[PDB]
Amino acid sequence: TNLKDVLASLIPKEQARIKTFRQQHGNTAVGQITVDMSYGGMRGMKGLIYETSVLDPDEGIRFRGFSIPECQKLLPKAGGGEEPLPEGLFWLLVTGQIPTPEQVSWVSKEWAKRAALPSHVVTMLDNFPTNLHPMSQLSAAITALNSESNFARAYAEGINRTKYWEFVYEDAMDLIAKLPCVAAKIYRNLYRAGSSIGAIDSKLDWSHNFTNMLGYTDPQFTELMRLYLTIHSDHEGGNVSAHTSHLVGSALSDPYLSFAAAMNGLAGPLHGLANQEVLLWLSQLQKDLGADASDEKLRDYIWNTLNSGRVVPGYGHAVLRKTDPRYTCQREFALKHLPSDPMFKLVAQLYKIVPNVLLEQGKAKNPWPNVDAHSGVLLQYYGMTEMNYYTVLFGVSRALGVLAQLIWSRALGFPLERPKSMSTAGLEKLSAGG
Amino acid sequence: ASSTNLKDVLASLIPKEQARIKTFRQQHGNTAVGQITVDMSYGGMRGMKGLIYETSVLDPDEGIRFRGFSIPECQKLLPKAGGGEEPLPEGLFWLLVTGQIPTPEQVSWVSKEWAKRAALPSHVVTMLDNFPTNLHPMSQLSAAITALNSESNFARAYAEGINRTKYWEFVYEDAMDLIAKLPCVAAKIYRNLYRAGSSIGAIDSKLDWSHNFTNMLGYTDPQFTELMRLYLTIHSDHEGGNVSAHTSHLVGSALSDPYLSFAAAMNGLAGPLHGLANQEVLLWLSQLQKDLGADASDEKLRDYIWNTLNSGRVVPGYGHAVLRKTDPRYTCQREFALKHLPSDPMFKLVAQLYKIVPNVLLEQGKAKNPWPNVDAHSGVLLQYYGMTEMNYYTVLFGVSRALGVLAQLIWSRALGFPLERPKSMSTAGLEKLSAGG
Numbered sequence: 001t002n003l004k005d006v007l008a009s010l011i012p013k014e015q016a017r018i019k020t021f022r023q024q025h026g027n028t029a030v031g032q033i034t035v036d037m038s039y040g041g042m043r044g045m046k047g048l049i050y051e052t053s054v055l056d057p058d059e060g061i062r063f064r065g066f067s068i069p070e071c072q073k074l075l076p077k078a079g080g081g082e083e084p085l086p087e088g089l090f091w092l093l094v095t096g097q098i099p100t101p102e103q104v105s106w107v108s109k110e111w112a113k114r115a116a117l118p119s120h121v122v123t124m125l126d127n128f129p130t131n132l133h134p135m136s137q138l139s140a141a142i143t144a145l146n147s148e149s150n151f152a153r154a155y156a157e158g159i160n161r162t163k164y165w166e167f168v169y170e171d172a173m174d175l176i177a178k179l180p181c182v183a184a185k186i187y188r189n190l191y192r193a194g195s196s197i198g199a200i201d202s203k204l205d206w207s208h209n210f211t212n213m214l215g216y217t218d219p220q221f222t223e224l225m226r227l228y229l230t231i232h233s234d235h236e237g238g239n240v241s242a243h244t245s246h247l248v249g250s251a252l253s254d255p256y257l258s259f260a261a262a263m264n265g266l267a268g269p270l271h272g273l274a275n276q277e278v279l280l281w282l283s284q285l286q287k288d289l290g291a292d293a294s295d296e297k298l299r300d301y302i303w304n305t306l307n308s309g310r311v312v313p314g315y316g317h318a319v320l321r322k323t324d325p326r327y328t329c330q331r332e333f334a335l336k337h338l339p340s341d342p343m344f345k346l347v348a349q350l351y352k353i354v355p356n357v358l359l360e361q362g363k364a365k366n367p368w369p370n371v372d373a374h375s376g377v378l379l380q381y382y383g384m385t386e387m388n389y390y391t392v393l394f395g396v397s398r399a400l401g402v403l404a405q406l407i408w409s410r411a412l413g414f415p416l417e418r419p420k421s422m423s424t425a426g427l428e429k430l431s432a433g434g
Numbered sequence: 435a436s437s438t439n440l441k442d443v444l445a446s447l448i449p450k451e452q453a454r455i456k457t458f459r460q461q462h463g464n465t466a467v468g469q470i471t472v473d474m475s476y477g478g479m480r481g482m483k484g485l486i487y488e489t490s491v492l493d494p495d496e497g498i499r500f501r502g503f504s505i506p507e508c509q510k511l512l513p514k515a516g517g518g519e520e521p522l523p524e525g526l527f528w529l530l531v532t533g534q535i536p537t538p539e540q541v542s543w544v545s546k547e548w549a550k551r552a553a554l555p556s557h558v559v560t561m562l563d564n565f566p567t568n569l570h571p572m573s574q575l576s577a578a579i580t581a582l583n584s585e586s587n588f589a590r591a592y593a594e595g596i597n598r599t600k601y602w603e604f605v606y607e608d609a610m611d612l613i614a615k616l617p618c619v620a621a622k623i624y625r626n627l628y629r630a631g632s633s634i635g636a637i638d639s640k641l642d643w644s645h646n647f648t649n650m651l652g653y654t655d656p657q658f659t660e661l662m663r664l665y666l667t668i669h670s671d672h673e674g675g676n677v678s679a680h681t682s683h684l685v686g687s688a689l690s691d692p693y694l695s696f697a698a699a700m701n702g703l704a705g706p707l708h709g710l711a712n713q714e715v716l717l718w719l720s721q722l723q724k725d726l727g728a729d730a731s732d733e734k735l736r737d738y739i740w741n742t743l744n745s746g747r748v749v750p751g752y753g754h755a756v757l758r759k760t761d762p763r764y765t766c767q768r769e770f771a772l773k774h775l776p777s778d779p780m781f782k783l784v785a786q787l788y789k790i791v792p793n794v795l796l797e798q799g800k801a802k803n804p805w806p807n808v809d810a811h812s813g814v815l816l817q818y819y820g821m822t823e824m825n826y827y828t829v830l831f832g833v834s835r836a837l838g839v840l841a842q843l844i845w846s847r848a849l850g851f852p853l854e855r856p857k858s859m860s861t862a863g864l865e866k867l868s869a870g871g
């Protein structure tokens with residue numbers, strides 16, 4: 001019931017909070033930067049303040065203090081569902097508080113009234129070739145939508161730093177509302193013979209309109225979509241996509257530009273693209289070893305994949321050190337809905353083998369699986385076999401998280417992200433020599 | 435030190451590098467290089483050095499050093515057009531990549547190579563020709579880059595299962611093609627918007643990259659050709675902590691292709707606090723003229739400056755995250771004006787500001803740096819030569835910046851830098867970590 005008002009009052013409490021805190025500990029040390037950290041992608045450096053979520057290496061992600069199961073229980077469900085609606089999540093990430101069902105409905109409704117594409121985007125999408133990857137299409141379409149930016153106007157217009165957050169809030173609501181429109185058009189155009197996406201039923205929830213535009217009607221596939229979109233929404237801020245959005249948002253680029261840049265990062269093979277990668281490898285697996293393999297043959301398939309310089313897709317993590325609750329959460333879902341699925345059973349079998357392999361191999365820090373290892377198998381089951389699209393789905397979810405933070409970054413006037421770089425030759429000089 | 439094919443040269447260079455970093459890392463990987471305080475975390479990583487970037491290094495007191503070289507030094511050492519004064523961007527790219535100063539031949543080969551690789555796919559052209567005039571030039575550029583990704587050789591190869599070792603090779607190809615296509619793209623944007631969709635003509639395999647650019651832009655003055663060589667050379671790289679450089683670095687570390695990494699960087703560059711400043715300094719200067727008139731007094735200037743600050747606004751093209759003095763790129767450009775457009779009224783106003791602004795900023799006590807940066811002096815040079823469409827200004831900066839960023843991109847891959855993935859913290863957790871306040 002008026003998320004903008006809600007924010008309007010939470011803001012100054014928090015501004016207060018930090019100032020006083022910074023006054024006290026501004027110069028207090030929270031860490032040490034090492035030569036290896038610099039060469040190792042800031043591995044283990046605590047270099048960002050990100051509010052919407054925190055990641056625990058052992059326990060996983062907590063969204064505003066809540067774990068996945070906690071959310072699963074707490075957040076409002078649909079009419080007669082079991083899976084939490086992403087609208088709730090979004091309210092939670094933004095507010096810090098559990099939304100009521102009324103609040104949740106208000107969002108759905110808000111996201112329905114704002115879903116609307118400019119024709120220039122439409123045309124573009126319609127002229128894209130079928131050889132251009134869906135993420136690229138997605139990314140390029142978003143960038144193009146920036147002509148609609150309110151923040152971009154207000155800013156040129158001369159707004160006060162103070163009001164920045166309000167513009168960003170509108171840009172943010174509008175993008176999340178349109179994303180499914182762009183995502184759906186992409187699918188259709190690529191996989192549905194360019195058929196129309198149709199309309200938004202103002203009376204449905206965001207996932208539900210999305211699935212319609214996609215042209216899927218299994219009510220269970222709807223529930224999946226809800227779960228899918230909830231769980232991929234945020235993953236603290238050091239992740240490539242979030243960080244990107246955050247780094248780019250810092251220069252004051254609008255939310256369209258920022259999200260788009262984040263998509264380019266999500267699309268990397270070591271990141272969100274792994275969604276799709278996993279699937280491709282699982283398929284090729286099935287071709288070779290066949291539908292039902294022996295643990296023994298599975299091992300070698302991995303033992304091979306390894307001494308051959310390749311990584312096992314969906315396994316490993318920069319931060320997590322244990323099995324990702326996102327993975328588990330998905331597996332519980334399969335267990336309740338597609339337990340007899342062959343692909344599913346394989347994924348399941350992989351779970352018992354890879355970790356030991358990745359343990360005797362001795363390189364990976366995290367021998368366990370991440371969300372990526374398990375999403376595709378679910379999708380595929382419901383008929384969405386177009387694996388080059390999976391990352392798009394992840395992208396649409398990630399907007400929830402990143403944008404929720406975008407508002408806060410500007411509301412708290414976080415400045416330009418600009419660290420200092422060094423050359424090896426200078427680092428050597430600093431230390432002495434290697 | 436030298437012969438013609440960059441690729442062969444690189445290939446040789448590479449392994450010695452790796453060995454070095456390796457042993458160095460062997461003795462000191464655990465050797466602490468610095469801090470981490472609460473303030474730097476909230477402060478956008480200000481003052482934290484936590485990134486390796488080989489191509490350039492910025493000294494806060496002296497300015498950018500290319501591969502140990504300063505601008506003036508590059509200014510003299512680098513090869514020039516047959517009959518120019520200005521360094522050619524091709525030479526700088528070579529320097530940046532190889533860490534060595536190129537010969538004329540060496541440069542010529544680069545030009546030829548960039549000429550050769552210059553080709554846009556139809557879909558991109560279609561797309562560009564279909565964009566509305568209200569779609570900012572930077573968005574066009576960024577969306578065009580992303581869509582060109584259909585061509586990525588690294589992407590393809592990667593999917594086909596190449597070895598981590600070979601990665602750099604495809605990135606070298608993708609970068610070369612991208613440096614090569616950029617002007618085509620940029621020119622098409624300019625044409626479309628300001629030249630009633632006329633055609634960009636063709637590439638002259640014999641010309642230098644900038645020359646072919648100005649031709650496609652429709653600019654024929656040699657002085658402007660010369661300005662372009664300088665411009666593209668000077669906005670090249672600025673160590674890796676700047677938004678654009680860092681964004682390409684971050685995205686590339688994920689194995690996204692160069693097209694993707696670059697386009698993302700473009701989105702950072704388009705930020706009002708970043709490359710977009712180019713444009714703002716000009717919009718700001720225009721407004722200023724309109725009010726104050728042409729021959730304003732220092733006192734009137736000063737005041738207008740104070741107005742801007744009180745409106746809660748920043749003086750455009752002044753201040754910097756790292757630099758603590760006047761940017762050498764600023765100076766460099768002032769010298770060029772001094773020599774070629776000593777009496778432009780706009781030029782004169784920039785010069786005036788130069789003597790007024792830093793004192794006011796000093797007085798206001800906010801800015802760590804009260805001196806000018808590159809973006810404060812670039813638009814005036816363009817304007818003078820007829821390129822008066824300021825919304826396009828950052829596009830040229832972007833074309834320039836592809837040189838630094840792509841040069842390191844190859845190196846990061848060549849050197850196997852991993853995924854850039856830091857640790858985020860919430861205020862609450864941070865507090866808890868400390869005691870709170």
Ligand SMILES: CC(C)(COP(=O)(O)OP(=O)(O)OC[C@H]1O[C@@H](n2cnc3c(N)ncnc32)[C@H](O)[C@@H]1OP(=O)(O)O)[C@@H](O)C(=O)NCCC(=O)NCCSCC(=O)C(F)(F)F
Nearest residue numbers: 270271274311312313314315316317318363364365366372
């Ligand atoms: C995600 C990941 C890149 C994390 O990077 P990083 O923190 O450097 O891994 P690490 O610290 O455990 O690296 C130690 C070594 O083990 C290797 N390793 C790590 N994970 C794996 C894996 N799943 N399979 C094989 N080798 C692996 C690393 O490549 C590295 O080897 P080398 O020393 O020869 O470079 C890494 O786990 C990986 O490559 N994963 C496979 C990626 C994939 O296809 N799907 C999973 C999604 S990637 C998700 C991320 O963005 C994340 F945060 F996890 F990095």
Ligand SMILES: CC(C)(COP(=O)(O)OP(=O)(O)OC[C@H]1O[C@@H](n2cnc3c(N)ncnc32)[C@H](O)[C@@H]1OP(=O)(O)O)[C@@H](O)C(=O)NCCC(=O)NCCSCC(=O)C(F)(F)F
Nearest residue numbers: 415707708711748749750751752753754755800801802803
């Ligand atoms: C580049 C800049 C963003 C660096 O930011 P930062 O490192 O945070 O500067 P800082 O620490 O000195 O700023 C401290 C205070 O001085 C103010 N200040 C800094 N520069 C200026 C300026 N040019 N005019 C007025 N006030 C300024 C800051 O806004 C800040 O005020 P507050 O604390 O009340 O928010 C900054 O000086 C600025 O805003 N410049 C003007 C931007 C512009 O339109 N053109 C110049 C190109 S920006 C160069 C860069 O480094 C960047 F990375 F941003 F691209």
